[PDB]
RNA sequence: GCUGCAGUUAAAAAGCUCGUAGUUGGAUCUUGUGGAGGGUUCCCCGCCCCUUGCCUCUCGGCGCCGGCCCGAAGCGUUUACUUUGAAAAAAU
RNA sequence: UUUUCGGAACUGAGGCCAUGAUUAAGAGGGACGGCCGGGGGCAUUCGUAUUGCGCCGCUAGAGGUGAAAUUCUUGGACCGGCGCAAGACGGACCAGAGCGAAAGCAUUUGCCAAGAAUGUUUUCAUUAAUCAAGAACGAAAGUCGGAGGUUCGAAGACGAUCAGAUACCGUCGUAGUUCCGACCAUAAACGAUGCCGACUGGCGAUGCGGCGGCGUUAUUCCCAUGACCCGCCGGGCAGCUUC
């Protein structure tokens, strides 16, 4: 059965980007998916997006610009502390110059570079580059 | 499907072709209609996929028979859909 | 997919987006409740009341005319039964196969299908016992089962 | 082996199989006929089996699969036998099954919602059968022997509906049962000049004069009694397309059964033409039918001016065959309808009620 | 082989189905204008509807010409998580 | 000594709150409707054929092999005809077709209980997925106790072949092969490929249910419905093609 909705949303975008398609449809929608998409959009990796109301959790249509190399999920939501975050970005990123880990923290869902300014740890959600 | 068709504006002939649960937003294919018969003329309401053998207020023995799809009327004077 | 078969068919209802009552409907909330109270005296279960009302009257969804689901409407007048709809129909099915096997002990398919019904009775009673619809001491028994539906 | 297997479960197990595709159609009559036959026993066979005596005659009409087809003569015989077999039991006792409760003998069928309106099923079962006799008479060639052999039932429908007077319990005679004496006049409103004088010029003093005879010798006086008494009760219905129709049959009484003036009287009191132009074609039949008699009776009195004044309206076009409902699908370059034609072929008057067109044109 | 292996043919998926413990489990329930540090909207005060969410005492100092105010306390449905204090032999 | 007044608790009438139920899953269960299939159990019924027996016809061979021989036959084999008996099996139609958890499942008709998919503006409302322990079913061969015994045939007795032939080829034949009641738990038990869920090209067919449509054909005179033809949607056993 469907054990996790965020893993479907990112696998569906990742298969559409590799085929060269200009749009994709995500279903079901969730509060976690809308907050994750917003972090990719603010850094310039995807275009703007629209939500459809249907009285059953809803759907999203997203616009693609061709810049995204990958996006993905770490399935157990492991806890991270500021001293251990270096080991995770050494494992998951392609260079020290670009790409982002996404964390959930009591100050909000955010970019791993913002978590250092806000002096906060959290749980891992995923990444993009 | 080409590489660039937009997903937010399907034409009504693209939407009417596909299954009721797989449309952009869901909608039934069934409907309500008003039905009338000879000999007694009090008009009555029926559902197009009925399971019941309907008897009218005019007390005729069968208004319609049930079936594996739409129910069939006993040559009644109306099959007119209600608009909403 | 189905819980005890290899099939994975898709058939189900699909409600419209618009929850409102239509302007042509002549019925009103308390007259719909009285029709529900009359149909309950005939021994009709909640699933049968909704098809009689959909087929022969204007009400497509009783919950949209009257603000309540129809098992609640019967319970608030004490008209609803004690043993619920689906658990009654599952127990009624298991006693029919047991009346077959007493004279047809070679029917090894009927022996196999009885394991798949009684394990589906156990799964549904375990759910109702945690939500206080049934006593904690409630138990299905192969000797007692005929007395549950009399 | 036991009475309450028979009168409840052995009934309801078959009586629900009315319209389903898996139905035997013949056995729905015959197994109710067995339940009426297996009725020798006390506290059943004098009484409550009347429920199956109702539901069996309801089941006779449905052997014919659809409403537009006519009943076959070989089954139609049983309807005229079995409606009388029901009515002749209404003589025996003043007390009710299949309606109100008065005595509680081994049944309680008064659990029905507003249960007295079940008793009106006797009226609908005869009204549903009077209308079906017209469907027999439209569907045999009038130029043949079979038509005259089927007119031999036109007295028998009257012999049934005339019985709905001496044996009647509804609320007295004045709630809504009065339908049966509009159905009464629908077999006398047309009856012609020779027949209307059978007690008046054919020997009036020679016939028998007891109360047994005087019920018939009232003749056309019943056709003014049933013009006047129940207008107050027919004023119950708001349906203009039923309310207006009666007067245009009633004038046809006076026009043949009395003086020509008494027909123009009830017409020019009533001013119905603009109303029947709002009403539907099967009411308009009576307006055009009656207005031509107001002209034919003017010629029969010799007043050639008022004969011309009345007849010229119908004679303003070659429409008389389409006003009878029997027009050709083509007879010029005009005719282009086909969806509506089969509705009017179902909605026209039978042969023997036609007034002759060579006579009309000569007059 | 947790990060990080493999199971059509090289070694390897129980003949098949049910099922208690174990592991895993769908959507949903409060936001934008104003000021400081910084930018050209967002992180601290105070607000559309609630900003410690309530509350009114009494043993106990404050502000002023008794009464009314502002720091404790009852405490915010219970935990994991995270960030910060305290307290932990030396040698290595 | 008694009230007052505070603390604890059983209990009655009464007006206030917008007085209190999130949705309805392209998750699952249950009802309902018309169909569908070599799916299972019990009874019933038909067809030739193979072997045996009775009676009639005619004359010298018949069987079997790469070639032979064992075997059968003038109280008559093989061949032709008519009729009777017993036990086993369901050809052709029969297909990359259907049904079942798998093992497996094909003459007629009736009876008993069960089921997938589809249709649905029915109902409950998270009841679910996968599984140590434990449990049901499980080809053929084999073991124990009854009944039957047509055909075929491990062991065995013989004829050939050959250096030998305890084999391949031929004639005969025990156990078994069929039914009833208990055991047994294995297989190249195979798609040599766990189950549940999401996404990613094109094309023509095929079985089941539903939806739409111009004609042809059948029954009654239309209508409805069956056989055919042109499209669409579910879910099924498969095929061709592509950087």
UniProtKB/Swiss-Prot annotation, chain A:
<dbReference type="InterPro" id="IPR000630">
    <property type="entry name" value="Ribosomal_uS8"/>
</dbReference>
<dbReference type="GO" id="GO:0022626">
    <property type="term" value="C:cytosolic ribosome"/>
</dbReference>
<dbReference type="InterPro" id="IPR047863">
    <property type="entry name" value="Ribosomal_uS8_CS"/>
</dbReference>
<keyword id="KW-0689">Ribosomal protein</keyword>
<protein>
    <recommendedName>
        <fullName>Small ribosomal subunit protein uS8</fullName>
    </recommendedName>
</protein>
<comment type="subunit">
    <text>Component of the 40S ribosomal subunit. Part of the small subunit (SSU) processome, composed of more than 70 proteins and the RNA chaperone small nucleolar RNA (snoRNA) U3.</text>
</comment>
<comment type="similarity">
    <text>Belongs to the universal ribosomal protein uS8 family.</text>
</comment>
<feature type="modified residue" description="N6-succinyllysine">
    <location>
        <position position="87"/>
    </location>
</feature>
<comment type="function">
    <text>Component of the small ribosomal subunit. Part of the small subunit (SSU) processome, first precursor of the small eukaryotic ribosomal subunit. During the assembly of the SSU processome in the nucleolus, many ribosome biogenesis factors, an RNA chaperone and ribosomal proteins associate with the nascent pre-rRNA and work in concert to generate RNA folding, modifications, rearrangements and cleavage as well as targeted degradation of pre-ribosomal RNA by the RNA exosome. Required for proper erythropoiesis.</text>
</comment>
<dbReference type="GO" id="GO:0006412">
    <property type="term" value="P:translation"/>
</dbReference>
<dbReference type="GO" id="GO:0005730">
    <property type="term" value="C:nucleolus"/>
</dbReference>
<keyword id="KW-0963">Cytoplasm</keyword>
<dbReference type="GO" id="GO:0003735">
    <property type="term" value="F:structural constituent of ribosome"/>
</dbReference>
<dbReference type="InterPro" id="IPR035987">
    <property type="entry name" value="Ribosomal_uS8_sf"/>
</dbReference>
<keyword id="KW-0539">Nucleus</keyword>
Curated annotation (Swiss-Prot), chain B:
<dbReference type="GO" id="GO:0032040">
    <property type="term" value="C:small-subunit processome"/>
</dbReference>
<keyword id="KW-0862">Zinc</keyword>
<feature type="compositionally biased region" description="Basic and acidic residues">
    <location>
        <begin position="1"/>
        <end position="16"/>
    </location>
</feature>
<dbReference type="Pfam" id="PF01667">
    <property type="entry name" value="Ribosomal_S27e"/>
</dbReference>
<comment type="similarity">
    <text>Belongs to the eukaryotic ribosomal protein eS27 family.</text>
</comment>
<keyword id="KW-0689">Ribosomal protein</keyword>
<feature type="binding site">
    <location>
        <position position="59"/>
    </location>
    <ligand>
        <name>Zn(2+)</name>
    </ligand>
</feature>
<dbReference type="GO" id="GO:0042274">
    <property type="term" value="P:ribosomal small subunit biogenesis"/>
</dbReference>
<dbReference type="GO" id="GO:0014069">
    <property type="term" value="C:postsynaptic density"/>
</dbReference>
<comment type="subunit">
    <text>Component of the small ribosomal subunit. Part of the small subunit (SSU) processome, composed of more than 70 proteins and the RNA chaperone small nucleolar RNA (snoRNA) U3.</text>
</comment>
<keyword id="KW-0539">Nucleus</keyword>
<feature type="zinc finger region" description="C4-type">
    <location>
        <begin position="37"/>
        <end position="59"/>
    </location>
</feature>
<feature type="modified residue" description="Phosphoserine">
    <location>
        <position position="11"/>
    </location>
</feature>
<feature type="binding site">
    <location>
        <position position="40"/>
    </location>
    <ligand>
        <name>Zn(2+)</name>
    </ligand>
</feature>
<dbReference type="InterPro" id="IPR011332">
    <property type="entry name" value="Ribosomal_zn-bd"/>
</dbReference>
UniProtKB/Swiss-Prot annotation, chain C:
<feature type="modified residue" description="N6-succinyllysine">
    <location>
        <position position="33"/>
    </location>
</feature>
<dbReference type="GO" id="GO:0006412">
    <property type="term" value="P:translation"/>
</dbReference>
<dbReference type="GO" id="GO:0022627">
    <property type="term" value="C:cytosolic small ribosomal subunit"/>
</dbReference>
<dbReference type="InterPro" id="IPR023029">
    <property type="entry name" value="Ribosomal_uS15_arc_euk"/>
</dbReference>
<dbReference type="GO" id="GO:0005730">
    <property type="term" value="C:nucleolus"/>
</dbReference>
<dbReference type="Pfam" id="PF08069">
    <property type="entry name" value="Ribosomal_S13_N"/>
</dbReference>
<feature type="cross-link" description="Glycyl lysine isopeptide (Lys-Gly) (interchain with G-Cter in SUMO2)">
    <location>
        <position position="42"/>
    </location>
</feature>
<keyword id="KW-0687">Ribonucleoprotein</keyword>
<keyword id="KW-1017">Isopeptide bond</keyword>
<feature type="modified residue" description="N6-succinyllysine; alternate">
    <location>
        <position position="26"/>
    </location>
</feature>
<keyword id="KW-0539">Nucleus</keyword>
<dbReference type="GO" id="GO:0003735">
    <property type="term" value="F:structural constituent of ribosome"/>
</dbReference>
<dbReference type="InterPro" id="IPR000589">
    <property type="entry name" value="Ribosomal_uS15"/>
</dbReference>
<feature type="cross-link" description="Glycyl lysine isopeptide (Lys-Gly) (interchain with G-Cter in ubiquitin)">
    <location>
        <position position="26"/>
    </location>
</feature>
<feature type="modified residue" description="Phosphoserine">
    <location>
        <position position="29"/>
    </location>
</feature>
